[PDB]
Amino acid sequence: GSSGSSGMAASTDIAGLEESFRKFAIHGDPKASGQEMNGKNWAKLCKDCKVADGKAVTGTDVDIVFSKVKAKSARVINYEEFKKALEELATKRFKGKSKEEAFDAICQLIAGKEPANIGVTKAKTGGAVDRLTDTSKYTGSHKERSGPSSG
Numbered sequence: 001g002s003s004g005s006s007g008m009a010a011s012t013d014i015a016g017l018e019e020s021f022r023k024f025a026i027h028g029d030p031k032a033s034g035q036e037m038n039g040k041n042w043a044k045l046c047k048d049c050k051v052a053d054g055k056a057v058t059g060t061d062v063d064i065v066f067s068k069v070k071a072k073s074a075r076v077i078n079y080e081e082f083k084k085a086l087e088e089l090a091t092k093r094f095k096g097k098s099k100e101e102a103f104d105a106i107c108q109l110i111a112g113k114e115p116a117n118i119g120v121t122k123a124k125t126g127g128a129v130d131r132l133t134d135t136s137k138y139t140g141s142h143k144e145r146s147g148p149s150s151g
Contacts, residue, residue, distance in 0.1 A: 014104070016111035021045065021082055024115040036076035039066040041115075046089065048118065049110040057093045065089060086110075 022034030024045035037045070043062050046052040052062050065088045069081035077085070083103075090102035097105055 014107050014111040017083075017107045018079055020049070020110045020113055020115075021079060024048070027115045036078060037082055038076050039063065039070075042066050042077055042082065042085065045110065045115065046085075047122070048115055048120075049113045051086070051089060051093060051106055051109050053093065057089045061092065062089060 021037065024041050025037040026032030026034045027041045027044070043052065043059055043066065046057070046062050047059075051057065052059055062085065065085040066077060068088070069084040070077045086106050087099065087103050090106040091097065091099065094102045094105045
């Protein structure tokens with residue numbers, strides 16, 4: 001008779017979210033300590049973690065949220081803000097779940113998941129349009145009279 005040997009434990013808190021965030025936060029960046037997260041990584045994190053399905057949550061929405069949590073000054077976001085975006089993409093991502101449930105649901109997508117490459121195909125080529133109206137002023141006959149300054 002062997003019978004099971006030990007087996008028990010509890011878990012109320014996520015305990016993995018902030019762990020994953022840091023990863024994506026310091027994604028590649030060896031200098032990154034995992035205190036800040038660039039919108040480029042944030043969005044990505046909301047991609048690899050399959051947080052931004054694209055339907056309910058669009059890379060544009062997350063982009064806005066990311067710029068809605070941070071400041072026109074700051075360029076990165078902090079966990080505090082990060083979780084804020086998740087909250088906005090929580091009810092926007094999931095159905096009509098609870099603020100906590102939805103948030104915990106979106107966390108269940110990150111918490112545990114890593115920014116690792118992961119053998120998965122998903123992306124979409126995208127560019128931008130540049131331009132700038134150039135009035136370009138041109139004169140011919142002007143500045144006839146001469147003077148030092150006093151006039």
